[PDB]
């Protein structure tokens, strides 16, 4: 999670964290 | 878009699609 290459975010199966694209 | 290995979904940067984990 640093820049916003896309509007819609996306989460992942780790510990509860998402990001852009 | 077939199996849900995780509750929180994630939208990829393509054309407006998401998935689980």
UniProtKB/Swiss-Prot annotation, chains A, B:
GO terms for cellular component: extracellular region. Its main location: secreted. Disulfide bonds join 11-18. It is found in: Secreted. GO terms for biological process: defense response to bacterium; defense response to fungus; innate immune response; killing of cells of another organism. The keyword Transcription does not apply. Keywords: Antibiotic, Antimicrobial, Disulfide bond, Fungicide, Immunity, Innate immunity, Secreted. Insect defense peptide with a broad spectrum of activity against Gram-positive and Gram-negative bacteria and fungi. No activity against S.aureus. Stops respiration in bacteria but does not permeabilize their inner membranes. Four regions are important for the activity: the C-terminal loop, the last three C-terminal residues, the stretch of seven N-terminal residues and residues 8-9 are necessary for the antifungal activity and dispensable for antibacterial activity. This is Thanatin. It comes from Podisus maculiventris.
């Amino acid at each position: 999670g640093s820049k916003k290459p896309v509007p819609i975010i996306a989460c992942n199966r780790r510990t509860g964290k998402c990001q852009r694209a």
